[PDB]
Design a protein around this nucleic acid. Structure first.
Lengths: 100, 103, 125, 119, 257
RNA sequence: GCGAGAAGGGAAGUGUGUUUCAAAG
RNA sequence: UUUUAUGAUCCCAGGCUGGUUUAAUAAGUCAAAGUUUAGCCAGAGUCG
RNA sequence: AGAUCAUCGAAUAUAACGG
């Protein structure tokens, strides 16, 4: 058994806890405190304000095939999200979920 | 999983206390000290059975970390958990050594 | 612990006056509690073995039934509030092994500490 | 004082000579042979700083375990491949910069990395 | 269809077997029953020849060897119950039975007795290791016995467990290990020069190298085998082996006989 | 301008869950 | 160098828990190895 | 953040790394 297609569990956007922290100043339990924002990010609005925004593609799980068989008739599969700025491009398309 | 009435019996409470230690600490003996600054601590746990009312034992081998590399093979030590992941195998930190085997 | 369970066979005899028993530290303490209740006439440590006398009344012995609860392969523990349910409406004698020595079941409930049921004397179902 | 500036072009020969991605085993030995870092730095010195710097986690070196094992690799060892992180050109540059200063500040009167201390 | 038959004996196995018997038959210049010159002076020269070791029997010859070895590890005169003396006494008894089995091969009753002594000696080492560690190492060097430490429980795998038969690896070079023949490690059939085809139940006994489970110099590296590198002690090549009597992967301990 | 999957069983076995603690973006 | 009968490699299926009263000197002080019905947690992405 | 028996389908076991 080599180079076998495995499967990983799904995971949505984890909501942050109200009782969070910015930076743990020398914590004195055996763990890491949660975050308020969590996955979400704060950006500048068009009208001079601050609002939430869906971040860059949140770990698009490519291991599991699409559920609805009729997905190609309305959506183009096998997409890529590249980041370019003038003549500079960075390699960050691989969205891997590391171990806990 | 244990039922509500199973959390008040003396058999379950006694087993819990033995397993439970400050800072979720554990007791075990080192069995492998080949890699640099690495030692594999073998910890022994306990569990309760509500059917026959008997407690058994099962070993739990885990990896630890040592700074001064004072511990050696066949030496009971103390481990402490951590809220992160360091290295491919390292998941614990040493505190002290209780017993030392001659050479 | 194994030697403790070997005392019931010797003490549970009808046509006998005195029976021997292996010497043990824990066994000596158990005999003291039984003598207080008036179940054993007396005992003497004869070196490697202990000679224990038997009490009789109108032919039949004072001890009629012995039940071993605790065994070397496992350990029975009951909370102070659970021992009362087990032991109720009975005249039996339960040996309780608490942290502060060995006492009977009646004293265990008085202190409210969690003991250990070792054996039963003059117990039914 | 007056720390020399490491030219980008010079590092290209060392990175390509030891050979896109390459393993970290061949790069550690080649760094000392070129003598760019200059006592003599031993092989264990670089290995110790690599783990202490927490580079395996930062770079996501453990992501390759799930490709072979899958679900079994998520759990800890006791609750497994252990290959080193294959640093790329970009990644290697950063590490060289980080290790170059960690040796100079080890004997400087004014620490730069960690100047503070808790009682 | 292949026929199951015994495997041929290797050329080196026969040569070593004859050498072992030669050593056991050596008769040094000494005396039996502690017949010191004090008492022997009262006897005639003619009569003294009979009392020499050359004229002694096997029982007397074997007993003399025990006395010489016992004195080497004697704590006090007239003391044989100490673990140090018992360790040497048992070693001489095992070889005495092994030599007899070579000449006599139809004595199947004594095959079971040899196993009892081999296991009994193993337990002695375990007890002596915890009570005295310095003395345990000294006795092994004098007798050239493979020292083994007991610090962790032995695993259930036979490829890495202990083997009481191969304890005296230095003195015996043909009872160290062998090959597996259970399901997949069986030998392939072959044709001899006989007009017939035969198959061997047991694999041939090869000659192992001298560096069997011995330390060696390692090279620093960082790969899968050494995620955290190589220790300084390993590079010099002086680490102490916990189980030197391990057969290793793809190997099995040698039979009893 | 604000709210809206309030009709979701397709993924996973040592996982999903439970329990003990902790959290001044 | 590492796991391995205290199950390592490996094939198919099953998602975890709570729910008040409840007779009998089994008078339960939490329904006594395992039985449920409004409920908690949790359940990837895409207009190129 | 720590700990946290596995079961059914009869069964068929040693595998992956470096000289």
């Amino acid at each position: 058994a080599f180079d076998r297609l495995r499967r990983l569990p799904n995971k949505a956007l984890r909501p942050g806890k109200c009782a969070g922290s910015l930076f743990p100043s020398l914590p004195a339990s055996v763990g890491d405190a949660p975050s308020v924002h969590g996955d979400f990010c704060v950006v500048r609005r068009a009208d001079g304000g601050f609002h939430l925004v869906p971040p860059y593609p949140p770990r698009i799980n490519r291991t599991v095939e699409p559920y609805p068989p009729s997905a190609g008739n309305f959506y183009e599969l096998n997409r890529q999200f590249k980041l370019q700025w003038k003549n500079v491009e960075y390699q960050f398309v691989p969205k891997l979920l590391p171990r806990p | 999983h244990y039922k509500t009435w199973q959390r008040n019996t003396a058999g379950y409470l006694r087993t819990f206390m033995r397993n439970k230690l400050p800072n979720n600490e554990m007791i075990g003996y080192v069995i492998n000290d080949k890699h640099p600054k690495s030692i594999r601590v073998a910890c022994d746990r306990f569990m309760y059975v509500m059917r026959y009312k008997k407690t058994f034992r099962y070993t739990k081998k885990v990896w630890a970390h040592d700074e001064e590399s004072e511990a050696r093979l066949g030496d009971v030590v103390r481990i402490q958990p951590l809220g992160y992941r360091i290295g491919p195998w390292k998941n614990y930190v040493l505190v002290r050594v209780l017993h030392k085997e001659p050479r | 612990m194994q030697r403790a369970c070997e005392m019931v066979v010797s003490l549970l005899r009808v046509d006998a006056l005195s029976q021997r028993c292996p010497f043990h530290v824990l066994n000596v303490q158990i005999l003291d509690l039984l003598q207080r209740e008036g179940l054993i006439r007396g005992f003497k440590v004869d070196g490697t073995k202990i000679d224990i006398l038997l009490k009789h009344y109108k032919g039949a012995p004072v001890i009629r039934n012995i039940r071993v609860v605790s065994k070397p392969s496992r350990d029975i523990w009951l909370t102070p509030h659970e021992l009362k349910f087990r032991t109720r409406f009975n005249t039996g004698l339960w040996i309780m092994q608490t942290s502060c020595g060995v006492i009977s079941h009646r004293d265990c409930l008085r202190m409210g500490i969690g003991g250990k049921m070792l054996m039963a004397i003059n117990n039914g179902y | 004082s007056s720390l020399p500036r490491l030219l980008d072009s010079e590092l290209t020969a060392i990175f390509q000579g030891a050979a896109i991605t390459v393993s970290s085993n061949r790069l550690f030995k080649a760094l000392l042979q070129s003598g760019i870092l200059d006592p003599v730095v031993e092989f264990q010195k670089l290995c110790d700083l690599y783990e202490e710097g927490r580079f395996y986690r930062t770079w996501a070196g453990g992501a390759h375990i799930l490709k072979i094992s899958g679900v079994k690799g998520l759990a800890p060892p006791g609750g497994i491949d252990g290959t080193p992180k294959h640093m790329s050109y970009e990644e290697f540059r950063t590490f060289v910069h980080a290790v170059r200063v960690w040796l100079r500040d080890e004997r400087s009167p004014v620490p730069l990395c960690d100047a503070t201390v808790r009682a | 269809v292949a026929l199951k038959t015994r495997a041929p004996k290797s050329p080196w196995y026969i040569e070593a077997e004859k050498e072992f018997l030669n050593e056991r038959a050596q008769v040094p210049d000494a005396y039996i029953e502690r017949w010191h010159g004090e008492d022997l002076s009262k006897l005639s020269p003619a009569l003294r020849r009979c009392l020499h070791l050359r004229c002694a029997s096997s029982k007397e010859l074997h007993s003399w060897r025990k006395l010489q070895l016992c004195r080497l590890l004697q704590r006090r005169p007239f003391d044989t119950g100490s673990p140090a003396v018992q360790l040497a006494c048992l070693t001489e008894k095992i070889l005495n039975v092994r030599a007899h089995l070579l000449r006599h091969f139809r004595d199947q009753q004594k095959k079971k007795v040899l196993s009892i002594w081999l296991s009994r000696r193993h337990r002695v080492m375990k007890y002596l290791y915890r009570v005295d560690f310095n003395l345990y190492k000294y006795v092994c060097q004098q007798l050239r016995i493979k020292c083994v430490r007991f610090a962790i429980p032995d695993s259930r795998d036979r490829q890495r467990a202990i083997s009481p038969i191969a304890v005296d690896g230095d003195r015996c070079k043909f009872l160290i290990r062998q090959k597996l023949w259970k399901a997949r490690f069986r030998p392939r059939q072959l044709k001899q020069v006989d007009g017939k085809v035969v198959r061997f139940t047991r694999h041939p006994m090869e000659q192992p190298s001298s560096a069997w489970n011995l330390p060696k110099e390692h090279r620093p590296s960082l790969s899968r085998a050494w995620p955290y590198g190589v220790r300084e002690e390993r590079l010099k090549g002086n680490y102490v082996i916990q189980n030197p009597t391990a057969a290793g992967l793809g190997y099995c301990p040698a039979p009893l006989f």
